[PDB]
Design an enzyme around this catalytic site. Structure first.
Site, mmCIF file in Angstrom:
data_model
loop_
_atom_site.group_PDB
_atom_site.id
_atom_site.type_symbol
_atom_site.label_atom_id
_atom_site.label_comp_id
_atom_site.label_asym_id
_atom_site.label_seq_id
_atom_site.Cartn_x
_atom_site.Cartn_y
_atom_site.Cartn_z
ATOM 1 N N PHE A 175 2.032 3.812 1.468
ATOM 2 C CA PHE A 175 3.150 4.100 2.389
ATOM 3 C C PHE A 175 3.883 2.842 2.949
ATOM 4 O O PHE A 175 4.841 2.970 3.728
ATOM 5 C CB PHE A 175 2.697 5.086 3.508
ATOM 6 C CG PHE A 175 2.383 4.436 4.835
ATOM 7 C CD1 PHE A 175 1.178 3.784 5.036
ATOM 8 C CD2 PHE A 175 3.291 4.495 5.886
ATOM 9 C CE1 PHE A 175 0.886 3.185 6.257
ATOM 10 C CE2 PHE A 175 3.007 3.898 7.106
ATOM 11 C CZ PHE A 175 1.803 3.241 7.292
ATOM 12 N N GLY A 176 3.468 1.641 2.539
ATOM 13 C CA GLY A 176 4.130 0.421 3.016
ATOM 14 C C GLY A 176 3.490 -0.892 2.590
ATOM 15 O O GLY A 176 3.189 -1.086 1.417
ATOM 16 N N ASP A 230 -7.149 8.231 -5.800
ATOM 17 C CA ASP A 230 -6.689 6.928 -6.271
ATOM 18 C C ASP A 230 -7.817 5.897 -6.299
ATOM 19 O O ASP A 230 -7.651 4.761 -5.867
ATOM 20 C CB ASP A 230 -5.525 6.429 -5.423
ATOM 21 C CG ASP A 230 -4.783 5.273 -6.070
ATOM 22 O OD1 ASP A 230 -4.991 5.042 -7.282
ATOM 23 O OD2 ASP A 230 -3.998 4.588 -5.365
ATOM 24 N N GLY A 261 0.801 -1.238 0.000
ATOM 25 C CA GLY A 261 0.000 0.000 0.000
ATOM 26 C C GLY A 261 0.829 1.281 0.000
ATOM 27 O O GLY A 261 1.988 1.281 0.427
#
Ligand SMILES: COCCNCc1ccc(Nc2ncc3cc(-c4ccncc4)ccc3n2)cc1
EC number: 2.7.11.1
Length: 263
Positions: free
Chosen positions: A21-22, A129, A19
Site C-alpha cells: 500500500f506504499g 504473498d 510495500g
C-alpha cells in the site's frame, strides 16, 4: 484495545522498499521500528479500506515467527508499524549476498516459517504473498513473516504463485494450499540457493507455463546433503493440483521428524 499511535510520536527515516500500500522506512518509536506507509493524504476508499483490513489482520497475530505489529497512524499519512529485523529478508541472504547457510539452519528457517504459517492458518488467515522477500531474519537467527498487504480471513511477484492463482476462476483461488505452494517455493529457494526457473528468461512464459503445468521447479538442483524427506516434501507443496497439497500441521510434523534424523 486501541493501537492507534497519536500524531507526532514517530521519527521516520531512510527508505527501504515500496510495500503493498506504499513505502517502507526505518523509524523510531520506543526503539527501532519499520513503518509501511502511504505517502499521499489523498486516500481513496480503495486505499483506505485496504489499510483498515491489513491492520485488522496484523492485530490478530501474536507469535514469535510473525512480524510483531505495534500500531497504526492515520494522520498525517496512513502508517503501519512493526518490529525492526536486524538481518534483512531471507531473499537478501539467499540471493543478494548469497549467505551459505548450514543445512541445519536451513531446515530450521523452514521449520520456523512453517510454524508462523500454521499459526496464521489456525487463526484462519491466508497470507497470500509468502516469499523470501517477506520472510525476515532476526539477529540472523529467528524468522519473522512479513508483508500482510494482501492477506485475509474466510502484485507482480509470480514465482511463488500456485498455478490456480495464476489461472483465475473464483476471485477465490486462494487457499491455505496456495500458501503451501508459495512455501514450497521457499523450501526450494532455501534448498537450492536459487530462485526457480532461471533457465527461462521470459517472465510472461513462466506465468503461462506454471499455470498450465508445463513448468515446475527442478528438484535435482537441491544441495547434496538435503535430506530426501525434505526433497519429498517440496514435491508435496509444489503439487500442481491444489487438493494434493498438505496443510501446515502435517508439514511442520514432517520437518520436525526429519530434523530429528539428522547428522
Ligand atoms: C547489500 O547490503 C544492503 C544492506 N541491508 C540494509 C537493510 C537492513 C535491514 C533491513 N531490515 C528490515 N526489517 C524489517 C522490515 C519489515 C518490513 C515490512 C514490510 C511490510 N509490512 C511491515 C514491515 C519491511 C522492511 C524491513 N526491513 C532492511 C535493509
Amino acid at each position: 484495545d486501541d493501537w492507534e499511535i497519536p500524531d507526532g510520536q514517530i521519527t521516520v527515516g531512510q527508505r527501504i522498499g515500496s510495500g503493498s500500500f506504499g513505502t517502507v522506512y526505518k523509524g523510531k518509536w520506543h526503539g527501532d521500528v519499520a513503518v509501511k506507509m502511504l505517502n499521499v493524504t489523498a486516500p481513496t476508499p480503495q486505499q483506505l479500506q485496504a489499510f483498515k483490513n491489513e491492520v485488522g489482520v496484523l492485530r490478530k497475530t501474536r507469535h514469535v515467527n510473525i512480524l510483531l505489529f505495534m500500531g497504526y497512524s492515520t494522520k498525517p499519512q496512513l502508517a503501519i508499524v512493526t518490529q525492526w529485523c536486524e538481518g534483512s529478508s531471507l531473499y537478501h541472504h539467499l540471493h543478494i549476498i548469497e549467505t551459505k547457510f548450514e543445512m541445519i539452519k536451513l531446515i530450521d528457517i523452514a521449520r520456523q516459517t512453517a510454524q508462523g504459517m500454521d499459526y496464521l492458518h489456525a487463526k484462519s488467515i491466508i497470507h497470500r504473498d509468502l516469499k523470501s522477500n517477506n520472510i525476515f531474519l532476526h539477529e540472523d537467527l529467528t524468522v519473522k513473516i512479513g508483508d500482510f498487504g494482501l492477506a485475509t480471513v474466510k502484485s507482480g511477484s509470480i514465482l511463488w504463485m500456485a498455478p490456480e492463482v495464476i489461472r483465475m476462476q473464483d476471485k477465490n483461488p486462494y487457499s491455505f494450499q496456495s500458501d503451501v505452494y508459495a512455501f514450497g517455493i521457499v523450501l526450494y529457494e532455501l534448498m537450492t540457493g536459487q530462485l526457480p526457473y532461471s533457465n527461462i528468461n521470459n517472465r510472461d512464459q513462466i506465468i503461462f507455463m506454471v499455470g498450465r503445468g508445463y513448468l515446475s521447479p527442478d528438484l535435482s538442483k537441491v544441495r547434496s546433503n538435503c535430506p530426501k524427506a525434505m526433497k519429498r516434501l517440496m514435491a508435496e507443496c509444489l503439487k500442481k493440483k491444489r487438493d494434493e497439497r498438505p496443510l501446515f500441521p502435517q508439514i511442520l510434523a514432517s520437518i520436525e521428524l526429519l530434523a530429528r534424523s539428522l547428522p
